[PDB]
Symmetry: D2
Subunit: 184 residues, 4 copies
Amino acid sequence: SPLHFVTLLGSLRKASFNAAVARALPEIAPEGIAITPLGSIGTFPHYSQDVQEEGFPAPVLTMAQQIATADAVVIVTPEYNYSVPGVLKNAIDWLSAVSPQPLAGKPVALVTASPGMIGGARAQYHLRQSLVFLDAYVLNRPEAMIGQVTGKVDAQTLELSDVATREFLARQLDALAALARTLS
Amino acid sequence: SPLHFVTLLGSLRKASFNAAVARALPEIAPEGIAITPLGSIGTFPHYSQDVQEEGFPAPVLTMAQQIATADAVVIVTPEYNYSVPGVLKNAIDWLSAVSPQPLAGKPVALVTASPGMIGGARAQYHLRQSLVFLDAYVLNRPEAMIGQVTGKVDAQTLELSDVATREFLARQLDALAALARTLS
Amino acid sequence: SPLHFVTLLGSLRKASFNAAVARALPEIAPEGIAITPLGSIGTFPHYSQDVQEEGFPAPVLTMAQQIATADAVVIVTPEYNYSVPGVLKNAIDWLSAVSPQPLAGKPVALVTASPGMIGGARAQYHLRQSLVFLDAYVLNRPEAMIGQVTGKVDAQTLELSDVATREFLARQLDALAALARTLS
Amino acid sequence: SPLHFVTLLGSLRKASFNAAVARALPEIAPEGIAITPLGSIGTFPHYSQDVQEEGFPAPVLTMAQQIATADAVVIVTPEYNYSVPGVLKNAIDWLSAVSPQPLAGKPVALVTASPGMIGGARAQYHLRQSLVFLDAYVLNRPEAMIGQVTGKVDAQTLELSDVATREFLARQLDALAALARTLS
Ligand SMILES: Cc1cc2nc3c(=O)[nH]c(=O)nc-3n(C[C@H](O)[C@H](O)[C@H](O)COP(=O)(O)O)c2cc1C
Ligand SMILES: Cc1cc2nc3c(=O)[nH]c(=O)nc-3n(C[C@H](O)[C@H](O)[C@H](O)COP(=O)(O)O)c2cc1C
Ligand SMILES: Cc1cc2nc3c(=O)[nH]c(=O)nc-3n(C[C@H](O)[C@H](O)[C@H](O)COP(=O)(O)O)c2cc1C
Ligand SMILES: Cc1cc2nc3c(=O)[nH]c(=O)nc-3n(C[C@H](O)[C@H](O)[C@H](O)COP(=O)(O)O)c2cc1C
């Protein structure tokens, strides 16, 4: 039976390593899994309750409905200052205020890429804490931290070339698929 | 000898309880301490490395220089989804990329206000982790979590009326003043 | 279909409020749920790989199987120094080293109690980070933080008296029960 | 002016890599710094308020005064289950209950070692949260995470061999020394 995962990207720069990792997921997705990207978090305005009462920003509603109708979400993000990038958290913040709230009961897998060796590990646990509050089911195993990403995605092609990393993510995706089927 | 603290506000809505708490600090500041607000984090664009290379946004540079020349910073913010509001973290993110980086060696005190009983405690530790990376010296004691804030700031005047809360913050400010003098 | 939960207690003192809360769970468990206590974490020696090479202590293996054969685990602990009590973390440390590891795939609900306003919340999230590594499924909703436990447990009888708190714990158990059934 | 640091060790096994790292510190300490070990955390019984009412165990009071009279403390610990080892947290628990509490105002540097890529980083931040409550000053920079410690300690002699790692630890000590002098 087919499944549909959507990806939420936490960096906005064109040469983003995390963007490259994210773009490789539809190509990597195992059989019975289709993966499409969500809109950019950059079209979102800063969360404000004054702006929310004037009406929810359109791209917020679009992402929410895309998340709600998907079987799982894969969040692919860098780590900024030992935590999650504000831009990404601002998106999570908009989604949390949406009714009904899209991440409740939603299987989610985390992927972080970094040039350093920690591979964005610190952000993941900060992100998990937020996701607890929204009642998402976040994949425990396996965890995907991609350190030393520069030697794993080639520049000017901005493609995830590393076969080992590619295989690793493909098995994470399978583990997320087992999770969404366990809760269905 | 006089001291100068600047305040960074984490909510953007007019009726923000945290804004009310922040506005009460110059009035509450003990003798030998002057407190001024910083610019809004809402004028900041989302952090992007592509935008940074085109030049630092003006209000980012203004806030950085205001932070660098101050004796301490007081961050007054709500808690969003068990963490720090993305908008605020986006600001921290911009400041981290500034050279020289304004929060290094900077005494900082945290204040959180919330209608619930936890009083924004969860955000504070997430924020502390980010501040470690930027080498800020964050006040350990006393901690300021204002739960049940609705009964402590009156509506339509948006003023921190609570005398007990006011006194508490005034002694926190004194504790931050002792910290900035210990490291000078 | 009946279910069997086990409780893990994080405090060692006779007059523990968290213990009173734990003792109340068998009595509060809804229809179709039986809840039994685990052994004291106080019989465990400090974790050491040297003590492990010579063999797992009997009470560690006992707790491991009781956890394994149970449908869910309920952890009831105070908060020590903004984190989890070392003695309780020590028990978690012992269990994690057991093969096969008992908490893998194990539905878990957390309950924390404190005389303070925070109600042991800081401990719950630190504990959640450890439980991710052990691939346990920790109940996201509802969360049980019991603040001001002092006026919620009758003294000299050490019984959980607050009915509102009591019915609350029963709603969590039903949710934990729902989680265990979703993962079977 | 001379300074005296004490080391707190988080592992109990004879062949501990973190122990080897701790043993190297007196030898690596720059001019004007003397570093002595504290007693084993393994002599401490599990924390209990009942065991405390009958009196603080002698080795807890011993560690407390050694910490008190020392200019700084260096904590060297592995990471257990994405957090701090229970046995080490247990020692922290005992110390926090001592009056006067030894870590108040105490300059502290953290060092963690792991065979893995993460180098015990997750433990450091959990530990930082506890240390905020105890009003210790934890060195922000530089941070010492020793990953792949296996190829950095000579086997059969259990000595810290990596010179790059060794000089690194000496740069932290100088920074810890600078912090202790800024707060005198
Ligand atoms: C403001 C800022 C904060 C950062 N913080 C961290 C960090 O805390 N830990 C880390 O390993 N890398 C950190 N980095 C580096 C990023 O991991 C690296 O720039 C990465 O390539 C950015 O992600 P991207 O390529 O998808 O844009 C930070 C970078 C920036 C610009
Ligand atoms: C998106 C969002 C997330 C929130 N998350 C939390 C939370 O995690 N914990 C909490 O106590 N309150 C939370 N709140 C409630 C705020 O604490 C409350 O709205 C507060 O008044 C907002 O701060 P302000 O008054 O300064 O704007 C959240 C509110 C919003 C809109
Ligand atoms: C070593 C120690 C650390 C503590 N740390 C905290 C804490 O971080 N936060 C808190 O709210 N209470 C803290 N407490 C207070 C406990 O919540 C209180 O002792 C509680 O009654 C203990 O739980 P119990 O009754 O089940 O033994 C601490 C107590 C001790 C002895
Ligand atoms: C119970 C237990 C939990 C562990 N948890 C982690 C962990 O979370 N992260 C990690 O990188 N290593 C973990 N390890 C592996 C240790 O880093 C490894 O055993 C290390 O050599 C122990 O430090 P030591 O040599 O000083 O005793 C764990 C080991 C044990 C026994």
